[model samples]
Target: EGMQFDRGYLSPYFINKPETGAVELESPFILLADKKISNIREMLPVLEAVAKAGKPLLIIAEDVEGEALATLVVNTMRGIVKVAAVKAPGFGDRRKAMLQDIATLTGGTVISEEIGMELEKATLEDLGQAKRVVINKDTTTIIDGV
Candidate 1:
């Protein structure tokens, strides 16, 4: 436990299940975002692609709330897709840098509008891949990031 590095804090939103404690996902696709995700429309295309691919999604962003979080949780509840969202660790520039670090670690891109990235246009290729991700009340850990 001492040597393993962890990132992020709080799984701000999730699909609650009777049997689960922590949000543990295996081979889940990752979305590294530098902006707040509040709209469902901006995420639908990407969500559809992930659903077709048949993998759980792990969203790390500055924040996930409102309609976006609602729909994501709904879909997960219905088993249309599996997902868990957490706030990106740190603040301001530090948060930006850490997001890049997670992207680097997972071989994914940081989708930032400041860099001309459009969430609706983001493809599955832009997402990161990991063997597994574990999210509890306090911390998020990505294992075997690829």
Candidate 2:
């Protein structure tokens, strides 16, 4: 030790700090995907595919229709999955890249075209986590990934 200080050596000006939980996943995951579907119900297949794996999921979607939005709301209220929906003005690489950024930012992997066309599924290894996931207007923010 360089030097030992007595009990009164520190100042009291900044003593307060908010409490937080130590809960964290053992490791990160890769649950990220971009989907172009007419309805939100279309996501059910991939969503259910990952359920038993017990990993978090994040989705980037387009064309959320009436019933689909209803289903999404119900599922989100029940904490089924976290989604970031962007109304695409024009579709192509730009929007896809943006979706990828959202995924990577949340510590997840984007399900690429090949795998997308294949199983359309992800395992426990392909998932991510966030303290919270939210999307609004044109902004999506995820807090704390593991």
Candidate 3:
């Protein structure tokens, strides 16, 4: 436990970063994922949701990675942290599964591609409400989630 606290957070980064048309987001939200995605477009809805939120959110999308993942992390750090994308590689196939459990445990919803739509289009209704989100280095925890 001491080492876990001492170690630090990890980024779900990639070999490359987006070159153009990337907007520095003013805020982020927590939006967990439950499926695999080939295109970064899939997460636009969730990102959009974060932009709309007044506070930060915790998201753990299984599909968030590679160029897209890096984009998500890079953009958030530069501006308002409206959303925090939980890096999924460490979780493997159990990624989204654990997300589901978190949602139930925290009362937040998991915005997954399985919801019959892309992540970027996730409406506030689709997003699980959180009262507060805290990112202690890489270990993120939702507080008083609604």
Q: Candidate 1, which segments miss by more than 4 Å at Cα? A: 1-20
Report the lDDT tens digits of candidate 2 across residue range 80-113.
5533333422368865675566556555565555
Error of 3 at 48 (Å): 2.1
What is the lDDT, from 0 to 100, of the residue 9 in candidate 3? Answer: 25
lDDT accuracy of residue 84 in candidate 3: 48
Off by over 4 Å in 2: 1-31, 39-42, 49-58, 74-91, 112-119
Error of 3 at 103 (Å): 2.0
Leading candidate by lDDT: 1
Residue 20 alpha-carbon offset, candidate 3, angstroms: 32
Report the CA-based lDDT of candidate 1 relative to the real structure.
0.79
Candidate 1 C-alpha lDDT tens digits along 12-113: 346343366668788989898899999989888778877899888888988888988888777776767678888888898999998888898888889888
Which has the greatest TM-score? Answer: 1
The reply for model 3, stretches above 4 Å from the true place, is: 1-9, 12-29, 36-39, 88-97, 113-117
> Per-candidate TM vs. native?
0.87, 0.49, 0.61
Query: What ordering of candidates by TM-score runs from best to worst?
Result: 1, 3, 2
